[PDB]
Amino acid sequence: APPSVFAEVPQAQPVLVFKLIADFREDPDPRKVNLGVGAYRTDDCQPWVLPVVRKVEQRIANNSSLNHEYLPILGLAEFRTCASRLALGDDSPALQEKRVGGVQSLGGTGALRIGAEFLARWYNGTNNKDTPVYVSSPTWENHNGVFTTAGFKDIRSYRYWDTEKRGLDLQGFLSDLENAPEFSIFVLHACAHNPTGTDPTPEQWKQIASVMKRRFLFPFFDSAYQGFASGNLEKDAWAIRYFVSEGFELFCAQSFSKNFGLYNERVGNLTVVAKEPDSILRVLSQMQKIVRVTWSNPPAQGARIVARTLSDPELFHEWTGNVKTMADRILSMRSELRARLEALKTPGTWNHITDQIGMFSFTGLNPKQVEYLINQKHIYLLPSGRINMCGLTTKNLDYVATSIHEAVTKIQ
Amino acid sequence: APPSVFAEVPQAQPVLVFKLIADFREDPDPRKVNLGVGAYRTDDCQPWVLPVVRKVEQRIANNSSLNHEYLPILGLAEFRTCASRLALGDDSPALQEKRVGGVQSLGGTGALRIGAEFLARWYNGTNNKDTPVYVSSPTWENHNGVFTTAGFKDIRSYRYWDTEKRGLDLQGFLSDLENAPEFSIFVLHACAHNPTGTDPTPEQWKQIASVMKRRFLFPFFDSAYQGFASGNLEKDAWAIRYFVSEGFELFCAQSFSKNFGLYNERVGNLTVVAKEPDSILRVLSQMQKIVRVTWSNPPAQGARIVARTLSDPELFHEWTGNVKTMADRILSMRSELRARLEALKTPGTWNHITDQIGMFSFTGLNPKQVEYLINQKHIYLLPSGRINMCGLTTKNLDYVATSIHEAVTKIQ
Numbered sequence: 001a002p003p004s005v006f007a008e009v010p011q012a013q014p015v016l017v018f019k020l021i022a023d024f025r026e027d028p029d030p031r032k033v034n035l036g037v038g039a040y041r042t043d044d045c046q047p048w049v050l051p052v053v054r055k056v057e058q059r060i061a062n063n064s065s066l067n068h069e070y071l072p073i074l075g076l077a078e079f080r081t082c083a084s085r086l087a088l089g090d091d092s093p094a095l096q097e098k099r100v101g102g103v104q105s106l107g108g109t110g111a112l113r114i115g116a117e118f119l120a121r122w123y124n125g126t127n128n129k130d131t132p133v134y135v136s137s138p139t140w141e142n143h144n145g146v147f148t149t150a151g152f153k154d155i156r157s158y159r160y161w162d163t164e165k166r167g168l169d170l171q172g173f174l175s176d177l178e179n180a181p182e183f184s185i186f187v188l189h190a191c192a193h194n195p196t197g198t199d200p201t202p203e204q205w206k207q208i209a210s211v212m213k214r215r216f217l218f219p220f221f222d223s224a225y226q227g228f229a230s231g232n233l234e235k236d237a238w239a240i241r242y243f244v245s246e247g248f249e250l251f252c253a254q255s256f257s258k259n260f261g262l263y264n265e266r267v268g269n270l271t272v273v274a275k276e277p278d279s280i281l282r283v284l285s286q287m288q289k290i291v292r293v294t295w296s297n298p299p300a301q302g303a304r305i306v307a308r309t310l311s312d313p314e315l316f317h318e319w320t321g322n323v324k325t326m327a328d329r330i331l332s333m334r335s336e337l338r339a340r341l342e343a344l345k346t347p348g349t350w351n352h353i354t355d356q357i358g359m360f361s362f363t364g365l366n367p368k369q370v371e372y373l374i375n376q377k378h379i380y381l382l383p384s385g386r387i388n389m390c391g392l393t394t395k396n397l398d399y400v401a402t403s404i405h406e407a408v409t410k411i412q
Numbered sequence: 413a414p415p416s417v418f419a420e421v422p423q424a425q426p427v428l429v430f431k432l433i434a435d436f437r438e439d440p441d442p443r444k445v446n447l448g449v450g451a452y453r454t455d456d457c458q459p460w461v462l463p464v465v466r467k468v469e470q471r472i473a474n475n476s477s478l479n480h481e482y483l484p485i486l487g488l489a490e491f492r493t494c495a496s497r498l499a500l501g502d503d504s505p506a507l508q509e510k511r512v513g514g515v516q517s518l519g520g521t522g523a524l525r526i527g528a529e530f531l532a533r534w535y536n537g538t539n540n541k542d543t544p545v546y547v548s549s550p551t552w553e554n555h556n557g558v559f560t561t562a563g564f565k566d567i568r569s570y571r572y573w574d575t576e577k578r579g580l581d582l583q584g585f586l587s588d589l590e591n592a593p594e595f596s597i598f599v600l601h602a603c604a605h606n607p608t609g610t611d612p613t614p615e616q617w618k619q620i621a622s623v624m625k626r627r628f629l630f631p632f633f634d635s636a637y638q639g640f641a642s643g644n645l646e647k648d649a650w651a652i653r654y655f656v657s658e659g660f661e662l663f664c665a666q667s668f669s670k671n672f673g674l675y676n677e678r679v680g681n682l683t684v685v686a687k688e689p690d691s692i693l694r695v696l697s698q699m700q701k702i703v704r705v706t707w708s709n710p711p712a713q714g715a716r717i718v719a720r721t722l723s724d725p726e727l728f729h730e731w732t733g734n735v736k737t738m739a740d741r742i743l744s745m746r747s748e749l750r751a752r753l754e755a756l757k758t759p760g761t762w763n764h765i766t767d768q769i770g771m772f773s774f775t776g777l778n779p780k781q782v783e784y785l786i787n788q789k790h791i792y793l794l795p796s797g798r799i800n801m802c803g804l805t806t807k808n809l810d811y812v813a814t815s816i817h818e819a820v821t822k823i824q
């Protein structure tokens with residue numbers, strides 16, 4: 001019996017964040033809390049289909065004029081346009097000057113992948129896999145994975161979090177920018193940095209931009225949480241817009257998974273900003289080739305929902321309210337968790353819980369204290385000490401607060 | 413000002429069909445016929461949303477229990493199971509022995525891409541990009557593209573379409589199989605060969621299988637037209653099932669874009685058949701890693717529609733009826749076209765028109781005869797002589813038959 005052609009395939013390590021979702025679901029323990037994946041939950045600890053989304057879905061379901069014929073390779077035109085406008089602002093000079101392109105993609109991950117594939121073939125030469133790629137220390141793990149898969153051989157880290165000050169290491173960040181070879185690619189979190197929840201202020205962003213401009217560093221923005229840093233979409237897009245106004249050419253990978261709560265419809269957009277309009281045409285032509293051999297053309301449901309919402313001023317307005325609701329709820333949980341930990345007289349400071357923005361808190365728990373929490377208390381979180389604040393409710397706040405308190409006093 | 417980082421990116425060369433369709437659209441002649449279309453069309457030249465699909469979409473729209481939370485990386489469990497079962501049959505020995513895995517993917521294209529990526533890393537050694545990959549001559553345009561992008565350096569062709577006989581070159585095909593290095597990968601069209609419509613008969617498939625078994629050639633089935641082809645789901649999956657029965661390990665990239673008419677919802681499945689059950693978990697663990705860096709997790713809408721249909725006996729029954737309607741309309745166009753060509757005493761043999769299966773047909777027209785039809789008759793088709801039978805209607809059949817009659821007699 002000839003051996004199987006799969007005889008030697010090793011067992012891969014699981015994608016942790018997703019593994020935890022499964023683990024958590026298979027947990028019979030009644031006290032279990034999922035503080036893993038960045039997904040919104042109500043105070044009832046339920047998934048929330050945004051009111052505007054439910055409204056648009058019914059409208060779509062009753063629109064007999066729609067068919068299922070293939071979308072264009074780059075995607076739904078109206079979606080591409082609305083998505084780019086959301087990041088850049090209605091008044092962007094880049095939009096006026098027609099030097100913006102958008103490629104509908106499979107969530108923020110697909111936007112990152114297409115961009116990385118394009119750069120590996122056409123940026124800083126032809127098929128140059130040697131240009132350094134810089135990611136924050138720490139970052140979302142998939143940043144490494146995507147760039148590695150596209151072929152980049154030199155992936156570096158720039159200092160970002162100061163474990164001591166429990167904040168941004170601006171000095172380290174700037175030095176890392178100064179030392180990077182010209183033309184290096186920088187993967188920047190647009191807002192609500194994952195996992196630290198710590199973003200540069202406008203003034204710090206200006207310092208970062210200054211070095212990047214000087215050394216011809218390419219900004220690759222990852223905009224997965226527009227609206228979650230502050231509850232305001234315009235405010236959260238400031239950095240991107242600033243770089244555009246400073247005359248940078250850049251990529252912006254946008255995800256609508258969290259701000260539209262459309263996680264499973266895989267709605268993303270790759271926004272491209274070039275110096276001149278002609279370049280956009282040539283870039284998009286090459287992007288079509290990449291898409292064609294990856295997913296061929298994108299799915300319609302999610303993009304249709306987002307296009308319908310953003311293009312209807314009333315719907316748009318309602319949606320901004322839904323986003324604010326989610327952000328407001330997060331603020332409230334930050335306060336309550338902070339308050340409780342202090343009331344338990346938990347060792348150390350807990351101001352970082354309330355200083356941090358976005359969906360997460362980079363708590364500071366060691367990997368030993370995490371293990372304790374998962375195994376003993378049935379509280380699921382990442383090994384890094386990252387917790388999803390949206391997983392907290394008025395009903396579980398106490399269990400969590402108490403469980404952290406023990407981990408902290410007991411596990412060293 | 414320093415030049416754009418995109419200054420040297422060339423404009424990609426455009427795809428012929430896009431142009432042709434453009435041309436078609438721009439044509440003022442009331443007699444114009446588009447035989448270059450790439451999807452199903454009714455007798456009225458319209459897209460068709462299957463009645464069962466509309467019915468299920470409404471059911472989904474009205475189901476308040478559904479949310480938009482992320483699916484697992486490999487996809488919706490019910491979909492993966494139903495899809496694999498459709499291809500292999502409920503009674504498949506492989507299903508009963510638990511040696512089948514399924515990965516939800518972005519249409520048939522996404523299934524082929526994930527399969528090619530897996531093979532380039534774990535098949536016939538580790539990261540072996542030198543294993544020959546064979547595609548039919550001719551084949552669906554994107555086969556070459558997907559395999560090349562996955563890293564395969566040696567893409568070959570096997571003889572298939574016989575220009576003179578207007579049929580399969582079985583002897584050429586077998587010689588190509590006999591001379592293929594052991595472990596070479598063969599991309600096989602399960603049924604409704606695209607673009608010729610010429611398939612091996614079951615007896616011929618047995619000869620193909622025997623060489624593959626002996627030389628350890630890997631069958632990578634592309635199954636885009638199950639049911640759609642003949643109106644019979646079982647008949648259309650015969651070759652796949654035959655290989656399973658014969659003990660092969662294989663991959664089967666399934667598309668639901670044509671048989672459910674869900675083109676724009678990008679619903680596909682990669683079915684994996686292994687010799688032993690334990691292999692499946694290892695193989696799927698590696699596919700999860702590939703998906704993670706490509707699209708992260710798949711969309712839900714299309715997969716929900718297909719899973720709902722295939723798991724409800726009444727809906728499944730209705731769906732089979734809808735598929736037969738499509739298959740019958742194509743059979744009818746083929747029979748009528750041939751009948752008319754023969755009535756006109758057109759030179760040559762035209763049995764290939766009814767021997768062929770599915771939407772596409774290689775007519776045997778030469779480039780000059782094609783030019784005449786476009787230029788003189790406002791009949792749009794590819795220079796290869798490929799036509800889509802769905803471009804024919806009860807209303808234009810006479811025009812088209814007469815026009816081909818003229819092209820053959822005057823240009824040949």
Ligand SMILES: Cc1ncc(COP(=O)(O)O)c(CN[C@@](C)(CC(=O)O)C(=O)O)c1O
Pocket residue numbers: 017036037038039106107108109110140189194222224255256257263267268707708
């Ligand atoms: C910084 C960042 N970029 C991109 C994405 C991708 O979003 P997508 O689903 O639209 O492709 C995420 C998602 N991060 C999640 C919410 C889930 C994950 O890891 O995929 C998180 O828990 O970190 C993210 O955190």
